[PDB]
Ligand binder design. Structure first.
Ligand SMILES: [Ca+2]
Lengths: 223, 58
């Protein structure tokens, strides 16, 4: 039983794959030149792959564009994982079609119980190793701050939220890091960390994008 | 040579799929493993050669 589903080709047109020789992280297209991802996804030599479905075969809708710049949030802490947000500027601007499109940043923070779509090429097995060819999707609701803080004591900052199912089984996992949590059209989260994946009582933890919206617009504009 | 070289590989809690190397003492080689992006332990090398330089002999 695999919690999520194969979204279908090019139906999450803002999802990107960050590649350094292989798929290592995902991210979201927020305009024709800018990508948002996680700070623990920072590497040298990133290529961005746009319009993918199967990340192992060339299907003709791809646009592979190198990053020109990679800006990790100035306050990222690598021990606390707080502020786990990065922006990547493409070497050249993508061309936006109907398989490549960008996703709107929010105007407010989503509340608890908002249902969201989480997407990625990451491990589809809670225990085990099984990275799929094609993109997978997962409808998960946002959790209350209270119960995220009970899930992971002393580890949640104001810049984090929890999402998924306390039962287990449906979650994001190794490979998914940096990709989108989209709720009602808007970009709310970035896949970030967890105690394993898809474990009982340990929901996945996500960067809260709604706090960074000023920082993002002003950093895109001045780079 | 060392003692951190004998530890098992640690993926950690982050959800990247980053391929790193660890010294596998039972094999007597450096192998690859999926590193999550954060909180690495010392048996975690960016290339086989840095692995064999640091650990090989343990
Ligand atoms: Ca492809």
């Amino acid at each position: 039983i695999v919690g999520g589903y194969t979204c279908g080709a090019n139906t999450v047109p803002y999802q990107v794959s960050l590649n350094s020789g292989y798929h290592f992280c995902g991210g979201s297209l927020i305009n024709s030149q800018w990508v948002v991802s996680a700070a623990h996804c920072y590497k040298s030599g990133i290529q961005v792959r746009l319009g993918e479905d199967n990340i192992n075969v060339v299907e003709g809708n791809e646009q592979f564009i190198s990053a020109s710049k990679s800006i990790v949030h100035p306050s990222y802490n690598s021990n606390t994982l707080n502020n786990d947000i990065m922006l990547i500027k493409l070497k050249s601007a993508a061309s936006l079609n109907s398989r490549v499109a960008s996703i709107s940043l929010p105007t407010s923070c989503a509340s608890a119980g908002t249902q969201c779509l989480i997407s990625g090429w990451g491990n589809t097995k809670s225990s085990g190793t099984s990275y799929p060819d094609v993109l997978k999707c997962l409808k998960a609701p946002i959790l209350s701050d209270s119960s995220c803080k009970s899930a992971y004591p002393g580890q949640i900052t104001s810049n984090m939220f929890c999402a998924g199912y306390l039962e287990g089984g449906k979650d994001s996992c190794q490979g998914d890091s940096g990709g989108p949590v989209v709720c009602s059209g808007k970009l709310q989260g970035i896949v970030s960390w967890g105690s394993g994946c898809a474990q009982k009582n340990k929901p996945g933890v996500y960067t809260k994008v709604c706090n960074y919206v000023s920082w993002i617009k002003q950093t895109i504009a001045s780079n | 040579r060392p003692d951190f070289c004998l530890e098992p590989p640690y993926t950690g809690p982050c959800k990247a799929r980053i391929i790193r190397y660890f010294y596998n003492a039972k094999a007597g080689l450096c192998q690859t493993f999926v590193y999550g992006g954060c909180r690495a332990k010392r048996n975690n090398f960016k290339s086989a050669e840095d692995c064999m330089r640091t650990c090989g002999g343990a």
